[model samples]
Target chain A: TNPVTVEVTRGLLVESRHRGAVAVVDGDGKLFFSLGDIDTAVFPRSACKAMQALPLVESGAADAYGFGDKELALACASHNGEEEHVALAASMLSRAGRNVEALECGAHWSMNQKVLIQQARSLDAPTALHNNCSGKHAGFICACCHRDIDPKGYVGYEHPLQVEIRAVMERLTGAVLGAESCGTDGCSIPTYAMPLRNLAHGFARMATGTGLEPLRAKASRRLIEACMAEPFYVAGSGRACTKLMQIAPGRIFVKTGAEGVFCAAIPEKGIGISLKSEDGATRAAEAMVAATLARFFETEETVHAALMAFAAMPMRNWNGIHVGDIRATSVFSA
Target chain B: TNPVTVEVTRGLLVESRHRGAVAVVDGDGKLFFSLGDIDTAVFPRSACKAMQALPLVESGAADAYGFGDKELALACASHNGEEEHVALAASMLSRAGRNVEALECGAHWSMNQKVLIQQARSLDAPTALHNNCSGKHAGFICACCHRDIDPKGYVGYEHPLQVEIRAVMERLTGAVLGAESCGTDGCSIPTYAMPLRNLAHGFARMATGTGLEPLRAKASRRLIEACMAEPFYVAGSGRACTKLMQIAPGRIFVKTGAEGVFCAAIPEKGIGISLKSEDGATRAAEAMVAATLARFFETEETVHAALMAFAAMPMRNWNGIHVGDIRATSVFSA
Candidate 1:
């Protein structure tokens, strides 16, 4: 039976149980740790960004734009559009001779509280650069320019850049995906459906360069190092991705997607961990991934010290009064 | 592993899993159907109202008060202070030469929509007569009068009336309980902690008079008949206990307690069902009991047709727009 993966509690009783699946795989796509059904195909959503940006590196636009660690990391970010993050996205665009107007990812207000406060002061509407996905979209346009392909409609499935990105996904995951078998993502790109384990396997390969040809293997290492070097560039303040990377810099990295999907790459352990909360609770997914990491590193006191914050989160309300907690159930225990 | 008992969904995904335990027992206390940890100890709280009213019936205090079906049912009620329910509670008090001031259950605003609207218009504070537990408290006072004991502090464990109620609880559940093992309830009476399985057994005996002496057996039948004959007195509008009784009439009786406890008696099946939601979510407990009843009566189309409304509840917001549903998981299947 599928056991409870995470529990949300108030007072002394478990108020909610998030029952879901997890897959930890070696570089070769062989299972190392598993729970629940790993073969169910669910949309990985934004968690695929790190792998999606592989084509940007592969197309040499990342180098053509004179990208630094921050820009490379930004290309895979679902950022908070804070001052630093927005500046870097703009910088990455300038190096490619593109501007904010060229960005196709629509404008939305900044998610960064500091930026929001400033916008509140001026009452000015945030531009496309303030969108969380702006960095990822900027990378797409830069990649298109290197290929001499039109930037317009680059989000389309038939576009050359998207074709290469999808092809890279198939090569990494060992799954042939197409329009018939995939659905459109919130960002207007095709999101493929594949077994959860396969997605974990994809992350394993993407992070460690396992079972890859020479150029892609180098691409994997470079991208991961970029994220490791600029953890804050991956996402801004209070994000799990940023917090997790900061807690274990250069050793492990994690990305969160909408709808309770999380993917992590641990180069030190040579394993990739992917999990999804069945009820699509973002908090549950965060707890699941953090607890899974804790289980693997239980013997490491330093890892436990910092990871414990996320692994056993004590929550509070807007008033900062203690409320309850999100706890990992024993589903992770052997 | 404990399977999910109830699923609350928002949009396309199961948003929450309210996992808990259930126990069903025969009249002889043999286990029939079960899930999760039925042996876990929990406070039955107000769900013991049916059994708690036993001393009033056995002492002939009910006859002294000229307690009709409405009074008998109200004695076991945790009711909204609607007009009818309030009037009956007052009449029950008047019959015993007591008034609202004798009630110790405390004052609360009306829970009935109709009464609440009227109360808002008048801006008058409600008395203890408007308390949901007022009917139960009135019964306690009447029972005290018959025993020639002081009505004041009848809620105390040392009080003779509470002594009998607690003794009856022990006899019915076959568990030795006292001040050491019991805790006080919201109604300021001793609440015993026992395995949920035994609570189901207690409900079995209390509802069907199984394993009891002839006098107690007659009292059991009288109380159940009273509840069946005056279902509305047990609770008020939109109450699960009242609705469940109305759905099946005399065939089934159910009562809800604070903190996610529920007890049910099915004399037709000669079984009792008691369940608790680990998170203390009243909605989950309600769906669980409703679904458990449906499981027993699935073959009866008439029962299915009526219970389906509760078994699968569609939730709406204040705007009355359909948002989601609370559904029973496959835990009940086989």
Candidate 2:
């Protein structure tokens, strides 16, 4: 069902509202909690990077090329194009024998403040290396190298690499082969659509490395390990996903997707949570996700405390006064 | 007293705080309400344009050049660089036998949405006529022509026209000549500094046309009439001053200033109000001023009612969700 997602405030006043959904699932693929219709199909957006990176690792390309955790982390990143992230992406391309021009993702200025300042000082035009998705493209090229496939035209959904990625997705989520719809992502990569519950189920399996083919399970563990090891590479400074992973550490791995989607894996607990604020307000989705985790994992006192900050974030006007908050409604637990 | 100014929001959360001040004054040069220090000196910014335009009209330049209410309104305007405004400024220059290149104010893109979209479609760089302050500068040139003074150096404080304008400011506010400080405005025009109370007093006199030399009084009345007659020329479509005047017509006239300054005149009520949010947050200053007006003019229920929407305007997230409000705090009425 459609639901109010957030409340606007000025002092004690409720100024307005936003609406959306949330879903949580365990390793056994049973829904733990739900909001809206969990069965409704949604494009998982960039939240499905873990599933997408599966074929890269499972094909033995990442290991065969001696790619480390940093490189693996970039493979699953929506990076801010900080120097570290850009340098790593370039290194990945170097190792894969691919040129920066080979990346299909269009050039964009870095969202990273430091990089932006540098770009401004140097009057440099942004290159594909500065594209947030460059790391993912680099990983795709490396996978092609390992499979003896031409890197050119590899972005096609029908390519063997994408075909293998789709197969891995089906195996992880327990969805029927060819059941899910495919669409082109902003980076021109193939993205999948499935019920939010199934999407959550895939993350749950990824967290636990359970009920997966031997190679896929190994790939799942490695991906999680890489993300946790290089949490900063997943996003960047002051970004919610980066901050959340840094603060929560091994207890949780989180990634944000475009258009208000978020996915998190509580590896030790074998639980996965996915949420979307239907209106696509990223702030509301972030607060709701943090609040949900705080409530679901109340036993983890320190984590819960940290999550509380994100649960109901304060907002200020330009003059720096405490005007209101982004708070979740009771529907979060209801 | 330094105080908190504006509040930012995502939804209900008070994400950050901004600190500043607010002051309101009535016709008798008496402080009515204050958030910080009513006596604090501030650059009245573009809010002082009514006073700034006195020399232009008093010199008979505007009338001699066949200028109408639209030109008079623009003389006191911090206009959005809309097509209407730019065209009027061009016509004013044409009538005065001056070229657009004579304007000292630099070019800026139109803040008006429709004009901006049109500019985008045509890929045009802004010209001097597109500067929001072009109308004011045009008035300056016209004044120089009427007095046979050099137009090139008119922007300087020592220019005979600026000296006359400064004298008018002292007379309007009943302040001792030379007591106020002067500075350059963003538009490269001379701006003055005085206690907010004195600034308020100047506006109150403008509203009442009281205790002034016959010429000054007539100019004041003419300026107020011109602003009320052509509210859109004073600002632009969808601007607060334009909308406020349209909503409250004949009874009130308002103008906004950069760095959180605001001035208004209630002609029928013989009242003048001025305010500044210390942190230079224009949104807070606007909300506070609107709320102050609503409170002060409760006897005028219809006018007050019309103002309530702006008093505490709701802010929305990108998805059209009501995220929070830019609201005034208790100090507004306290």
Candidate 3:
């Protein structure tokens, strides 16, 4: 009864490996998946930054608010917050007539290894501006200026600025959450949960912004442009999330959230991709995403290559025993 | 702070309710989601049936073995296995000079309620031929005739027929699996676990099989014809899984599976749609699928009407409190 089988070792297995979901959609919100449920209302944590930064761009925050390219990039970033990232954020804040005290987002160490190393070199802990999503915070400040609203508590769930942003999400993505449980995200923001397809619709809007009102059109374009321009800081290298944006070039915009949630939108193609790692394993999330993207692009070989590392491991033996091989087997949406 | 906040209820929650994954893909596999790490490696359960049946038709099983339309339909179905299903399967076997016992797939009661009602009225119990997916079983029988192999144990994962099906799944969908891990499916046949995108690829190939290979081309045509001719029996009505195929006509091929999964290939438009109910709830799977298809054809209003009953449920007052309302939201790829 011997037959061909793919193998993998247990070492690479993470607890969340057993629980994960991956999906892909075209410009129109058509989707495909590997595992787990993906509700449209699921709060994707920090991934919402790009959209959150949109109101700023609309309010002339990028220029009049003194926010430049780096800050603009940070506005959409879930960065390593390296020293370069921090310095750039700080510089951008200063140039925009803002200060560290103005940032509403809390202080957190930079995600950028380089920034962490620089912090070690300087013997000082990173500041709030050093947080990867800080650029997003700065952008929020600019939005307040343009709208003539108070900037304090901008990150709070009930803030008018956030409320407006939620409206923007609903309008652009055709999303309207109904009677669902709400929760606070890791960054202390309100998050909603719903069907996975609704999230796909939101992503579709992110790409094209076709359905937006006339006033929001310019803002949508600006947001898409920033995401396309600074895709790396949007997530990072080797990260399937960032790669989705980069590989698709300006055609796609992607962001990842806490608890292994990932979302992306392809404006021109009218597609969206999303996934939730059931147990919150980032690797599984990445693999599912890479596979989904490969399928969407019809890059079969590429998708297989991305999955090869996760598929099998060579069988070895103690003192050359050639005992057996380990194989990877995961289930997905069919 | 008068912000329009949509309340979402627990019952209508698809992902949390079903505890499964759902996705949609174009002819290519791109995705969107709100749960788990969704990279394409997750095994798509029974949705691979279309692919499995493709080679059967292409190999001239239909012409060579006198397989007819109904037989072809069953080849791609996950049925309730009612008396009609069993009778049709038995007839196909008889037409091929085979017996009921030749079926490798074991017996089960009908998954279709109508058929269950019929059985109850007739005072009969369901049998092997009555098992849903019996058409697939019959196809195995036909394959045995054409391939000159014994029909015995054809449902076993180790059977040559299964080997070929596995190879087709692996080659077409790009999902490689271990024999042992690919446990027996509900129909007593080996079922695979693969990513949603891979399944889409397989369906796409089936739809576009023309000129790829003689067998593939035959399967492509036969698969469509079968589903189109008998849409209701393919899976059943009121099931979004089957309704899409019925509504879309010749444009798409659709199928459903256990544990909340659905897939389809749009031959004319060169697209595929796949969905998984996060919590394995058929309602969510159906509603999401109908929604995805409606979005695809841009017949939003029509789709809305057809699916409105599930789209947004009315909220009633508890003790005249008028608690809130629950509704669906969508996030689409551009």
Once fitted onto the true fold, the runs of candidate 2 whose alpha carbons sit more than 4 angstroms away are A112-115, A175-180, B1-334
Among residues 3 or more apart in sequence or in different chains, the pairs in candidate 1 whose N, CA or C atoms overlap within 3 Å are none
**TM-score, structure 1 vs. true:** 0.56
TM-score for each predicted model, relative to the true structure:
0.56, 0.55, 0.46
Residue A215 error for model 1, in Å?
1.1
Worst 10 residues of 1 chain A by lDDT: A315-324
Candidate 1 ranges with C-alpha deviation above 4 Å: A110-124, A317-321, B1-334
Query: What docking grade applies to model 1?
Result: incorrect
Order the candidates by TM-score, highest first: 1, 2, 3
| A53 Cα displacement, candidate 3 (Å) | 54
Model 2 Cα lDDT, one tens digit per residue, A174-277? 65434235545667666666677888888998888778877777789889878988888888776888888876676778888865788888887788888876
- Candidate 3 lDDT: 0.57
User: How high is the CA lDDT of each candidate model?
Assistant: 0.78, 0.75, 0.57
Interface RMSD per candidate (angstroms)? 10.9, 14.2, 20.1
lDDT of candidate 3 over B1-334, digit per residue (tens): 1111112342333222222333554444445322332343443456667677865686666778776666777777777665556677787788667977776555554444445444544544445676677787787788788777888878666878777887766666666866533644555665655666666656665666632456565667677778767776576534555666655466657776654566766677666656555323344445455545555555556544654444445543211222223334443222
lDDT of 1 by residue, A1-334 (tens): 4467877654354445667789999898789988887886766877878888887898899988788789888988888878888888888788778899888666655545445544434444667787777788889988988888888888777888888887898988877777655655555566676667888888888777778998998888888888888988888787888889887779887888866888888887788888887655677788888888887778889988677678678865322434457888876767
Q: Which stretches of model 3 miss by more than 4 angstroms?
A: A1-334, B1-40, B299-304, B307-328, B332-334
lDDT of 2 by residue, B37-134 (tens): 66655777789898889988988898899988999999999898887898899999887688788887777656555555454444446777877788
TM-score of the first chain of model 1: 0.95
